[PDB]
Paper text:
After solving the atomic structure of ANKiso1, we determined the 1.65-Å resolution crystal structure of ANKiso2. Unlike ANKiso1, the crystal structure of ANKiso2 closely resembles the predicted AlphaFold2 model and superimposes with a root mean square deviation of only 0.541 Å over 143 Cα atoms. Notably, the concave surface that was previously occupied by the α5 helix is now bound by the C-terminal helix of a symmetry-related neighboring ANKiso2 domain. This interaction is totally fortuitous and could mimic an interaction with substrate that has displaced helix α5.
SKD3, also known as CLPB, is a ring-forming, ATP-fueled protein disaggregase essential for preserving mitochondrial integrity and structure. Ankyrin repeats are one of the most abundant motifs found in eukaryotic proteins and the Ank domain is the defining feature that distinguishes mammalian SKD3 from microbial Hsp100 unfoldases. Here, we present the atomic structures of the isolated Ank domains of SKD3 isoform-1 (ANKiso1) and SKD3 isoform-2 (ANKiso2). The two isoforms differ by a 30 amino acid stretch present in isoform-1 (exon-5), which represses the protein disaggregating activity of SKD3.
Residue numbers in the entry: 131 to 308
Write the structure that this text describes.
């Protein structure tokens, strides 16, 4: 990606609030994508940077994009680079607390906030239009990745409300409200 998009991903990772705002005003893509597959919103979410998540959503970030990163091993093959570089970059530019063996293809920012078990980040994404029913490539919802506690309770409630809005054909009504 461009210099501005690359700086935005780093500022979103680093919780550098001033820089995120600056870069967006200079034309950085709010859906900026790392060469290895993830967005600024995803990396803000896994790092519990709920203030960065707020800013990106306000500038129009799509909450429902899925990660193109799969696993260290598979992504390394699909890109023709060695797994060592992929592992270091995933750990250094994204987050170092995830399972290196697992596949994350199709994970949304909400999947990642749930793995981070952060109530505030999860709530901000749900309030921002994140679809709690959207599954990743392995077929898991964000609630599938929740641990017991306040995030799992919030997701259970939100799933039921989202399903009811979908059945009543009124998702767009509620999206344009507070």
């Amino acid at each position: 990606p461009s210099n501005k998009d690359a700086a935005l991903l780093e500022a979103a990772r680093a919780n550098n609030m001033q820089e995120v705002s600056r870069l967006l005003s200079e034309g950085a893509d709010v859906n900026a994508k790392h060469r290895l597959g993830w967005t600024a919103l995803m990396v803000a979410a896994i790092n519990r940077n709920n203030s960065v998540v707020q800013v990106l959503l306000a500038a129009g970030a799509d909450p429902n994009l899925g990660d193109d990163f799969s696993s260290v091993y598979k992504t390394a093959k699909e890109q023709g680079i060695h797994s060592l570089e992929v592992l270091i970059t995933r750990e250094d530019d994204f987050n170092n607390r995830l399972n290196n063996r697992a596949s994350f293809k199709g994970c949304t920012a909400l999947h990642y906030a749930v793995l981070a078990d952060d109530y505030r980040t999860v709530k901000e994404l749900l309030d921002g239009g994140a679809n709690p029913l959207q599954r990743n490539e392995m077929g898991h919802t964000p609630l599938d990745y929740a641990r017991e506690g306040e995030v799992m309770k919030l997701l259970r409630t939100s799933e039921a409300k989202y399903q009811e809005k979908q059945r009543k054909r009124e998702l767009e009504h509620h999206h344009h409200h507070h």
